Amino acid sequence: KVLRDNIQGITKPAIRRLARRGGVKRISGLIYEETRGVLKVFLENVIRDAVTYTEHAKRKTVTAMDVVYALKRQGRTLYGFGG
Amino acid sequence: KPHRYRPGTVALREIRRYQKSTELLIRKLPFQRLVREIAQDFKTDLRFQSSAVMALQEASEAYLVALFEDTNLCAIHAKRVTIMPKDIQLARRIRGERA
């Protein structure tokens, strides 16, 4: 019973865990939805660029360095994976 | 005997006026004196080119205005009408300059 949108594959407890790491004590139920949408929004930008470098290089395979380059564009550099 | 506007009744009027208008608001003379005062520490007897000074004025007000409008929202988010310094700290915190 897994055939659906994979966004719901992000289980509610997984969110509950992340709020803890950010130090959030108490969470209302309505948070679980926009967090999905907000996170959803975040992917849209990064992959679009990530796709762009790959197809510009004519490559059909998304490689690791393509990720950091796009992440660098949004003002969030990523140490640890190349460059 | 003389008419009095209700509290805040006047205040909203300047809001409408000033956003329509697009001129500077700081007194011209003191601002040029202040920048001279602060800049004195980094370097002695520097000469400010006349056109350069108002640029600092223009950016400052633009930077300043952005602060208050942002600090305004959280006050509403706090169900308040009047801003107090704790809001600005929060706003400066979230953008990431104070911290």
């Binding site: 660029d49 762009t52 470098y53 510009h56 290089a57 380059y69 564009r73 | -």
Partner: protein, 95 residues
């Protein structure tokens, strides 16, 4: 003397192409003279990096086009890209 370059006349020329009547003040003219610059390196920026990024030693329109999608968001991409595609083929038609 003291010859200084800008883009004032070109800003004026296109203005007429859309609005042959309305006037502009010298202050706002400088802003375009400023703004027309401001974009220029920004697109030139990402264009430059991509060349090394594919280890390519030359900048070409293909490089530019992808950079267009990167910087400008929304529909201006496909709009301007169509313009750019239209523009180049016109020049190559009269190369």
């Amino acid at each position: 003397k003291t010859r200084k370059e800008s883009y004032a006349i070109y800003v004026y020329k296109v203005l007429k192409q859309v609005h042959p009547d309305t006037g502009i003040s010298s202050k706002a003219m400088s802003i375009m003279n400023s703004f027309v610059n401001d974009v220029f390196e920004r697109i030139a920026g990402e264009a430059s990096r991509l060349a090394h990024y594919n280890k390519r030693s030359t900048i070409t329109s293909r490089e530019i086009q992808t950079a267009v999608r990167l910087l400008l968001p929304g529909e201006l991409a496909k709009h301007a890209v169509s313009e750019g595609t239209k523009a180049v083929t016109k020049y190559t038609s009269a190369k």
